[PDB]
Nucleic acid binder design. Structure first.
Ligand SMILES: [Mn+2]
Ligand SMILES: [Mn+2]
Ligand SMILES: [Mn+2]
Ligand SMILES: [Mn+2]
Lengths: 247, 241
DNA sequence: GCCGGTT
DNA sequence: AACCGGC
DNA sequence: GCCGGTT
DNA sequence: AACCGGC
């Protein structure tokens, strides 16, 4: 990670930080503001990075050619926008924040990519693990890493900002940081109903995986396929059986 | 619908207004059907305020006088229990309905969907196909076939400089649509997805029929998704394990 | 504690 | 509660 | 037109 | 992008 060396800083700055009454999505901006101040040459919003990539290559027009600028099938897959959106891009028609985008922030350096999400949590409310990332997208990601042998190109990490309502604004009370690729893949909770999302709180994320990036991919694909099989038959029991009587 | 007879009115007041764009409608409905119109959370408060005698969740759950409505409108046991005149419910993202209209102990559940017609059409989550399944099951077990409708109002808008402007609307009734026509997007939180404007309204049977017909559709689509899971999520990745 | 459905 | 983009 | 994954 | 409640 690029932000880990200064995490203790981020942690200490964000704590006690307040914002005017995700619900706490103004806390993301602080993290981005901070990143952009201490690692400014590394820090991008995902759309910002796409904009920079294309601005550096004005000659390169069309989606075909523009996709080539990625030098990576897995990154092309995680990062790019659609073909018409890419074809249509211009200095006048730049990319903007996109609901669906994979990552909140990109830390890039020497061709190594850290995709960073900021999750925000209302510590008052009962714990409810948030959607992290699509288990399916993650399966595809794992398959593309293996097919193209990209096991040393990018990490997917998380920064959780705990907050509470203090009078008339939100205040951050603590944070956590975890690395997707350091967890035991077979331990990832896939919530099929919840748009097929891996779900957890960062603070709970296991961080003891031992093998290589390749082994993680293989093991996650095993876990995915197993959970998918289980869910298939588990659907008959929960969504069919209970209703058969009425028909 | 209580809304339908005055749809022209609504349409006419909304078209051209300026400001996802959370668009009133509530305002209009309130100022024209005051004693019929409620946010969901507000209707809950109303119900409990009107019965200070009752306390505890079990007792206040009886105030609904309907297993189905209880299923659709009520908060959890604890939050009900802890409800107080000095501790009211607030808007909850999770609530079934945007607006509830009730007259003569009949309920119209109204969602207001918004839509940027500048962008390319993408059917929105409407309601959980699994929630709807439980709903029809409850309607049948409890013979509540004349109690509530679930209806939708689509506000089409478009960005003009600084201000976002409504430029058309649609209204449909869920229980007038061909149940087997309803698109159940499993991956999308098991949601029914449609735009209102596109919603079949040619159903002619009874409420009971609709419910039984829907459950048949649901059970069928659940099996199909179960099976489809193998091809979509299993075979494509086996070559790696 | 464990678990998964909904906006 | 929306939201894009493959073919 | 058709269809369905993601934040 | 997060959000409750059943036992
Ligand atoms: Mn993101
Ligand atoms: Mn975020
Ligand atoms: Mn609603
Ligand atoms: Mn709405």
């Amino acid at each position: 990670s690029f932000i880990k060396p200064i995490y203790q800083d981020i942690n200490s700055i964000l704590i006690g930080q307040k914002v005017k009454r995700a619900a706490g999505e103004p806390f993301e901006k602080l993290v981005y503001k901070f990143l952009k101040e201490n690692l400014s040459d590394l820090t991008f919003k995902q759309y910002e990075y796409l904009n920079d990539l294309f601005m550096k290559n004005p000659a390169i027009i069309g989606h075909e050619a523009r996709y080539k600028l990625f030098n990576s099938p897995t990154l092309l897959f995680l990062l790019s926008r659609g073909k018409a959106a890419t074809e249509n891009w211009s200095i006048e028609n730049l990319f903007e924040e996109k609901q669906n985008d994979t990552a909140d922030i990109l830390l890039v350096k020497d061709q190594f990519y850290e995709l960073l999400d900021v999750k925000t949590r209302n510590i008052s409310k009962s714990a409810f693990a948030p959607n992290i990332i699509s288990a399916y997208k993650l399966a595809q990601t794992c398959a593309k890493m293996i097919d193209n042998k990209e096991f040393d190109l990018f990490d997917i990490n998380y920064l959780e900002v705990d907050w509470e309502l203090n009078g008339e604004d939100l205040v951050c009370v603590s944070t956590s940081f975890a690395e997707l690729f350091k967890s035991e893949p077979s331990e990832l909770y896939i919530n099929w109903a919840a748009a097929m999302q891996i779900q957890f709180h960062v603070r709970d994320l296991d961080q003891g995986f031992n093998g290589t990036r390749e082994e993680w991919a293989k093991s996650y694909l095993k876990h995915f396929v197993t959970q998918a099989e289980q869910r298939a038959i588990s659907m008959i029991d929960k969504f069919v059986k209970p209703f058969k009587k009425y028909i």
